[PDB]
């Protein structure tokens, strides 16, 4: 299916910042369109988005350069090529950029085209993206509806409260379909607003559509979530489990973990592991993301020995969707799960490779949004088409989050009996 | 272009509540999909959405009944019909529902199908929705890019502060294209966050993607907006004007207006508003009096209407019977257009036309509960409405409309002029 036109444009993301949208047009009239979510433009470890840095537009956050890469050299290199050959398309862009971290054209440019190409190819093949992804994956007809971990309470750098943990999430493991999981999520989300209102706390929402009320401790956040779960008529631990992201790099100083909102105490790597362990005995927390600093591999080795048999230990900053880092982690018994941010790697082909590496090693892959999102819902198709089993795509408000849940609804409706919702067993450590 | 399948489903809106999505499929494969935004389930003046009221699902807010109406009675009535005949398609649904307020099937069911049908027909005709809308409107090839009024600060019932006024908005009138207007909005939006953070105020967002910080008065609210516009490098009154929504019913008591942050008679409240428009470049005032206060509104329109846009929202509820009576009685000079408040594309085109014929302005509006659907962008362009009210510059429920406007302007160029200040009534 020959590519005939590629169009790049600068659109606006859910935080009001520019991002890249691409369209891939094929002979026969087939069109795919996708957008890149927000990412890092500096740093040594992940694929880098290209930003303009022109202070006179969007406070330096323009993406005109990345859009120009799409419309110019990327378009020129891809016109006439076969969109169905995803690896080939991705390789052309990867080689043309020439940098490991896609920092010439920008991972935002390359990813937008990579995804739009895949959508266009699916259309040409008369099938939805999730079906095409399964074919590209060498696992045709193999699907699941992912178990969502849904942002609910924010802290640390993502709030202005005394909660140290960056976010707490609910997982409707007791649901029997993704539609039910979404409804459960919605009901808990609404009951939490009522619970917080009665406490005199603020219920306006953050980037991911959840709450950041002025709670005074990590324990208070867990308690308020438990209360909302009860209010909604669900059973904590059976119907709904908890997941957290510590973003522990945010409190790492001089080789120790200092928690302000815990009386500014300075835990060793081992002590912080046991702090977390105690939380997991007090509440049904079954997944912990970035529970130590990304550099703290000795600490992660210990945390994995102590918690890994019964708790999902998700590397986000730890792995930055990097197969080179993931491979070494696996070799060294570091964590047992990885957050998949496709814009940290920059192409669909490479994203499939990361998901596969995790699965082959018995690690779980959790398909993730970014803080800056769009109306795009490609991660829903990605999670289903690779049968990843889990998704982290926000609270139950803001269409930058809910667009993904709606797409999961459409996909489950279409696939029916062919896309099981497996519930708690998707989570690493849960049988 | 023959309808061969209609599918309704329950999806989730931007506030986490259910709404209706519909697909209309035509012979040859053409498909359109759209969703209803949030609306009213009760009341005697507007079209009503149908809600389930099952306490065990979605706190009683399920839309299974409206979705069933799409999949059953609506589907079978419309299958076989020509999707290009929008008025005919809408007439079938309206007649079948058989009520005056669409309360049998729900305005949510009817609108979702009405819009999805229009998109399907547009696809059959090999054209974008905005182009099809212009043809349906009988104004083929007539377009404009709307001047956005963008939520920026919330107060009243839409906040927990000491601001009486419900909504303050910015209008980037000085922009030359909607793409520029959108950048200007984004820049002011980000500068306001900076200003609020410097004051130790909360910068989390409300339903429309704007801020609702703990401001002590209407005066403080306008002050921070002015500061942000300046910080962004724009001139208030020139590059950017101000619009507001009083929601004046919220302080209406015994025929008087009691603010509790500033007991006005109808005339006295009009002059209170007049005083604000002298002090700040407020050029548009929505629901400046209670919807029932028609003698008050005639007075407000006489006093302010030559120089200020006076937008009926609760006053008109997108109802042409009310708008007609308003026009003849000299009531307001503008109307907010909420397509789910009337319930069909055909009736929406009629409301916009009635407004325009009387010299009133039509402001195409979002609802509090939205989706990623961007139909209102195509609607504003295809009817050359001239103004849009679709949120602050955050949340993709808002920003998806701005993105669609960018896509449309990219295609149309000079064929869809951004006319700026002059779109506003009184300007």
């Amino acid at each position: 299916s020959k590519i005939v036109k590629i169009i790049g444009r600068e659109i606006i993301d859910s935080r009001g910042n520019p991002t890249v949208e691409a369209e891939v047009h094929l002979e026969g009239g087939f069109v795919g369109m996708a957008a890149a979510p927000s990412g890092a433009s500096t740093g040594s470890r992940e694929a880098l988005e290209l930003r303009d840095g022109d202070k006179s537009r969007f406070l330096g956050k323009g993406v005109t350069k990345a859009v120009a890469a799409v419309n110019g050299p990327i378009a020129q290199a891809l016109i006439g090529k076969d969109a169905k050959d995803q690896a080939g398309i991705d390789k052309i862009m990867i080689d043309l950029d020439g940098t490991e971290n896609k920092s010439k054209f920008g991972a935002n440019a390359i990813l937008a085209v990579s995804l739009a190409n895949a959508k266009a190819a699916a259309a040409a093949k008369g099938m939805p993206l999730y079906e095409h992804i399964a074919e590209l994956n060498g696992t045709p007809g193999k699907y699941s509806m992912p178990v969502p971990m849904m942002n609910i309470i924010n802290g640390g750098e993502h709030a202005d409260n005394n909660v140290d943990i960056q976010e707490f999430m609910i997982q409707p493991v007791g649901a029997k379909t993704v539609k039910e999981a979404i409804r459960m999520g919605s009901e808990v989300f609404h009951h939490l607003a009522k619970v917080l209102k009665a406490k005199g706390m603020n219920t306006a929402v953050g980037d991911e559509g959840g709450y950041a009320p002025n709670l005074g401790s990590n324990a208070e956040a867990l308690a308020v979530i438990a209360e909302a779960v009860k209010a909604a008529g669900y059973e904590l631990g059976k119907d709904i489990t908890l997941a957290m992201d510590c973003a522990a790099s945010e409190f790492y100083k001089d080789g120790k973990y200092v928690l302000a909102g815990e009386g500014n105490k300075a835990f060793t790597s081992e002590e912080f592991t046991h702090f977390l362990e105690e939380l997991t005995k007090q509440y049904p927390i079954v997944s912990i993301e970035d529970g130590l600093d990304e550099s703290d591999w000795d600490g992660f080795a210990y945390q994995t020995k102590v918690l890994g048999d019964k708790i999902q230990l998700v590397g986000d900053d730890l792995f930055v969707t990097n197969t080179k880092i993931l491979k070494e982690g696996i070799e060294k018994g570091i964590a047992n799960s990885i957050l998949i941010k496709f814009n940290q790697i920059g192409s669909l082909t490479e994203t499939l490779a990361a998901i596969k590496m995790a699965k082959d090693a018995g690690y779980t892959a959790v398909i993730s949004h970014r803080s800056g999102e769009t109306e795009d819902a490609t991660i829903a198709d990605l999670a289903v088409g690779t049968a990843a089993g889990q998704i982290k795509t926000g609270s139950m408000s803001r269409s930058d989050r809910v667009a993904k849940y709606n797409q999961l609804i459409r996909i489950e409706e279409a696939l029916g009996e062919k896309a099981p919702y497996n519930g708690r067993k998707e989570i690493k450590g849960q049988a | 272009s023959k309808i061969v399948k209609i599918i309704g489903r329950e999806i989730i809106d931007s506030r986490g509540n259910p709404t209706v999505e519909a697909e209309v499929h035509l012979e040859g494969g053409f498909v359109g999909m759209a969703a209803a935004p949030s609306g009213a389930s009760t009341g005697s003046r507007e079209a009503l959405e149908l809600r389930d009221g099952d306490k065990s699902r979605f706190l009683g807010k399920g839309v299974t009944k409206a979705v069933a109406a799409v999949n059953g009675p609506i589907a079978q009535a419309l299958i076989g019909k020509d999707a290009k005949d929008q008025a005919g398609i809408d007439k079938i649904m309206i007649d079948l529902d058989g009520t005056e307020n669409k309360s049998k099937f729900g305005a949510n069911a009817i609108l979702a199908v009405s819009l999805a049908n229009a998109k399907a027909a547009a696809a059959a005709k090999g054209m974008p929705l905005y182009e099809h809308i212009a043809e349906l409107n009988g104004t083929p090839g007539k377009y404009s890019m709307p001047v956005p009024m963008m939520n920026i600060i919330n107060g009243g019932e839409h906040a927990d502060n000491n601001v009486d006024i419900q909504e303050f908005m910015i209008q980037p009138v000085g922009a030359k294209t909607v793409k520029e207007a959108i950048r200007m909005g984004s820049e002011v939006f980000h500068h306001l966050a900076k200003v609020l953070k410097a004051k130790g105020m909360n910068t989390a967002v409300g339903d429309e993607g704007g801020y609702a910080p703990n401001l002590g008065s209407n005066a403080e609210a306008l002050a921070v907006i002015a500061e942000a516009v300046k910080a962004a490098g724009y001139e208030l009154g020139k590059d950017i004007t101000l619009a507001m929504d009083c929601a004046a019913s919220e302080f209406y008591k015994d025929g008087k207006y009691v603010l509790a942050g500033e007991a006005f008679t109808s005339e006295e409240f009009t002059h209170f508003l007049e005083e604000l428009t002298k002090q700040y470049p407020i050029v548009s005032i929505e629901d400046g009096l209670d919807e029932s206060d028609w003698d008050g509104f005639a007075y407000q329109t006489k006093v302010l209407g030559d120089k200020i846009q006076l937008v009926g929202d609760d006053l008109f509820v997108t109802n042409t019977k009310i708008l007609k009576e308003g026009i003849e009685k000299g009531i307001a000079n503008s109307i907010l257009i909420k397509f789910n408040q009337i319930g069909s594309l055909t009736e929406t085109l009629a409301a916009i036309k009635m407004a325009k014929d009387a010299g009133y302005t039509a402001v195409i509006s979002h609802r509090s509960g939205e989706t990623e659907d961007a139909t209102i962008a195509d609607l504003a362009v295809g009817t050359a409405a001239g103004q849009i009210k679709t949120g602050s510059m955050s949340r993709s429920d808002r920003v998806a409309k701005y993105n669609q406007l960018i896509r449309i302007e990219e295609a149309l160029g000079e064929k869809a002029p951004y006319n700026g200040r002059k779109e506003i009534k009184g300007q």
């Binding site: 369209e23 009239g29 069109v31 795919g32 369109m33 996708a34 959508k119 699916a122 259309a123 008369g126 939805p128 993206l129 109306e375 795009d376 819902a377 490609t378 198709d381 709606n406 797409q407 459409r410 279409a414 | 061969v4 399948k5 697909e23 499929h25 035509l26 012979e27 040859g28 494969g29 053409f30 498909v31 359109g32 999909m33 998109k119 547009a122 696809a123 974008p128 929705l129 961007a374 669609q404 896509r407």
Partner: peptide
Amino acid sequence: ASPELASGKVWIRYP
């Protein structure tokens, strides 16, 4: 193409 079709939120069902 419509944003719904191009984005892959709706699919063709008929030839």
